[PDB]
């Protein structure tokens, strides 16, 4: 993104919480912020310096200051729970407006629960079928916003990477996926493979080795 | 009070064409300059293409990766805008957003000056791209390698969703996780299943995933077998 957020932060009830973007053009644009709930239109929060719309609740307010703009919610309410996306001029100057990738906002409503991660190499039976597949399953945590990443031999793997979005289980912690397409001589042909899930700005990485 | 909503959305072959419509009230649609602006499935928001009022220029403008293909009008009579896409890409598979766009200024000294903020917007529409048809997946066992052990089913390469999985015919549920299931850029599904399981258990007894894929009448079980 020419627009940095994090992914995901919490922030328990009442509370202050400040969300970040970044980037070399809001050293010289103002940056509005967005607001989206699960399937539903998003609401816009702010813009520039002091625009609130009316409507958007006292709680809500903008900032800037360097290459960051920041939202900051003062008393943070459940129904909160949205992502937060800032927006601002392309850093060309050509006349069009770029986004960042969004930052998913808990407001906490139950404990913390880091996420449990299973990696499972490719099956015999899907090598056997001139296929591989790697198999990253991440349960069990809140809140239900990770990152994943995946890894071979220590250099960034970025193609045949399919990742979910977290999505709530029925004891209402989250789960997500990970899955590493490669060919079967790819999956040979390196040492190990790692995915690593990053929750909060706190790593849980497993690997696997061919044998 | 502004309401909008998008329709037209639906799954269509690459190189196809849809037609978008946003229908809009609760603000003078003439006076309004309008935008579209997609999501697609992971990666955030991206804007598509804007059209001034008629008392401006009623011109069009529109981002790189869509020039050339995609048309955006608006019949003011009708308080409606439309988005016309031909020779769709898997790449424009996402959620497609109708907004009001406003204008304000800051401090920056370039020209032309302005930043363009989305005052409102629709629940938006999705379109899938995809040369996907109705097929059954392949199960392939997740192979078990504190006192417990992790084993699983992988479902591979169906459509459409859903696939229903359970373990030993509903007979296990202790323990069992089965995940969203991924959409690939062939427009086909994975879901994998997981269950936790006594280590101790491990060839004593047996685990079977039952996998049902409704649309194809496939029903398939797979049992999963240590190492
Ligand atoms: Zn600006
Ligand atoms: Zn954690």
């Known amino acids: 993104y020419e627009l940095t957020q994090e992914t995901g932060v919490s922030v328990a009830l009442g509370r202050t919480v400040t969300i970040t973007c970044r980037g070399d053009s809001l050293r010289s644009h103002y940056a509005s912020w967005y607001q989206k709930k699960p399937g539903q239109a998003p609401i816009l929060l702010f813009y520039?310096?002091?625009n609130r719309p009316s409507g958007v609740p006292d709680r809500f307010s903008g900032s800037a200051s360097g290459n960051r703009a920041s939202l900051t919610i003062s008393g943070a309410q459940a129904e909160d729970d949205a992502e937060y996306y800032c927006?601002?001029?392309?850093?060309?100057?050509?006349?069009?407006?770029?986004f960042g990738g969004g930052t998913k906002l808990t407001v906490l409503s139950q404990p913390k629960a880091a996420p449990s991660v299973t990696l499972f190499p490719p099956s015999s039976e899907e090598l056997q079928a001139n296929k591989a597949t790697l198999v990253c399953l991440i349960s069990d945590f809140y809140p239900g916003a990770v990152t994943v990443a995946w890894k071979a031999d220590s250099s960034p793997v970025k193609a045949g990477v399919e990742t979910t979005t977290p999505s709530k289980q029925s004891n209402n912690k989250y789960a997500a996926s990970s899955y590493l397409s490669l060919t079967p001589e790819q999956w040979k042909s390196h040492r190990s493979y790692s995915c690593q899930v990053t929750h909060e700005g706190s790593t849980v990485e497993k690997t696997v080795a061919p044998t | 009070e502004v309401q909008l909503v998008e329709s037209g959305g639906g799954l269509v072959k690459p190189g196809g064409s849809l037609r978008l419509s946003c229908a809009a009230s609760?603000?003078?649609?003439?006076?309004?300059?309008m935008s579209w602006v997609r999501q697609a499935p992971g990666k955030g928001l991206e804007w598509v293409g804007r059209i001034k009022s008629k008392t401006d220029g009623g011109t069009t403008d529109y981002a790189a990766p869509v020039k050339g293909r995609f048309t955006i009008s608006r019949d003011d009579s009708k308080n409606t805008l439309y988005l016309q896409m031909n020779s769709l890409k898997t790449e424009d598979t996402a959620v497609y957003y109708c907004?009001?766009?406003?204008?304000?200024?800051?401090?920056?000294?370039?020209?032309?000056?302005?930043?363009?903020?989305?005052?409102?917007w629709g629940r938006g529409t999705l379109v899938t791209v995809s040369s996907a048809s109705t097929k059954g997946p392949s199960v392939f066992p997740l192979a078990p390698s504190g006192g417990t052990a992790a084993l699983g089913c992988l479902v591979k390469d169906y459509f459409p969703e859903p696939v229903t999985v359970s373990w030993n015919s509903g007979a296990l549920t202790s323990g069992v996780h089965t995940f969203p299931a991924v959409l690939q850029s062939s427009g086909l599904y994975s879901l994998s299943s997981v269950v936790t399981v006594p280590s101790s258990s491990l060839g004593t007894q047996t685990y079977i995933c039952n996998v049902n894929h409704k649309p194809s009448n496939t029903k398939v079980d797979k049992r999963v077998e240590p190492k």
């Open positions: 907004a009001r766009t406003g204008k304000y200024y800051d401090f920056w000294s370039g020209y032309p000056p302005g930043e363009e903020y989305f005052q409102d």
């Open positions: 520039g310096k002091n």
């Open positions: 927006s601002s001029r392309d850093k060309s100057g050509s006349r069009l407006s770029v």
């Open positions: 609760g603000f003078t649609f003439s006076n309004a300059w």
